[PDB]
Subunit: 69 residues, 6 copies
Amino acid sequence: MKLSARNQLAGKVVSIKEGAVNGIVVLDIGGGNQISSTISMDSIRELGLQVGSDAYAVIKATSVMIGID
Amino acid sequence: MKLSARNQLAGKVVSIKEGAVNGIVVLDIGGGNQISSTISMDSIRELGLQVGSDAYAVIKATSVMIGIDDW
Amino acid sequence: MKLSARNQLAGKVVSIKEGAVNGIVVLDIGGGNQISSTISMDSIRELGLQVGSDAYAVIKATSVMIGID
Amino acid sequence: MKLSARNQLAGKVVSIKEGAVNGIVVLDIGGGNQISSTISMDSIRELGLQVGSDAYAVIKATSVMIGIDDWS
Amino acid sequence: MKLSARNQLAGKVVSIKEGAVNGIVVLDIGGGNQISSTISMDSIRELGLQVGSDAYAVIKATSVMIGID
Amino acid sequence: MKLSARNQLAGKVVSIKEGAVNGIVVLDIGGGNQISSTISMDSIRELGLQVGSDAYAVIKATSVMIGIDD
């Protein structure tokens, strides 16, 4: 599928913390930036995610806030 | 303030597209990646955002999905 | 791509309301159900969406609440 | 109450996956479509949700993305 | 309807700023706190919201972050 | 940090329900109102949140729906 979401950031999975219904996937997207994703364990298994998997952090623009110092 | 949001990615404003109640801020976060953020115009003003401003893309972990090519 | 989101509902576009930076896409997903999606105008154009286009409503499970009468 | 959410889809609960703080409710909304909802276990209890209960999947329009096929 | 959303905060509308597809409703919920809600203009009209309307701010728990000084 | 999020509500932690990857922080914001927050356990530890901590409920405006009595 092709998605409307303005943010689709390629990266490699560096860790997966598993829970009973959800897990937290950490993605290295390069340049020293990491994105953490809290998603269902069902989706983590269905996508075959492992440490080292290539993937994308997918974020709708309306979910992104801006901060300043 | 210190925020629980797992994703707080430093970057520079590349563009601001203004609307009536919301606008879209594009952040260059390095490594060739940019993040687009849809936020209220009042917040864009209150935060003093301009092209070239230093800022952060702030994202709650429960807002991030994962995709794969699945070739 | 293949997306983690638990909800990926095929449907046909029945209306598009254009705004300044966002628009509202309405999808007929069958069974008398329609879904409205508020997304950026850039994504509406980049995806080539028109009335009658085939598309999908994509929703993360953590975005869905449950109600009862 | 009456809710602003543009998406309020009637359906029947077909499964509930219970966890420690959250659970996943799957709603059959007809036409071959199902909606999965991740919500707190306390909410599942307070609403008395069971397999077979009537309910609604409630989704804010700003939470819905659109996809198209890869070959479009 | 009765909603799963853990946050349902009673208040009065103190401001409505209208846009083309969305608007922003500000609700005074007491104690000096106001909650701003960005929702579709259709919902604003359909709920009959005006300055002075009684309403509720409804927020899913997974949408709420915590901050500290 | 200064956040664009239009909703930033001061309160005191009255409870934390811990899970394996997320927890639920209940914040008393006064006037009889509470805010519940489902966030990662890493964040709860990273902010040192405990019962009695002063904190803020932070909500993006696009995350808030409005309801009315019918």
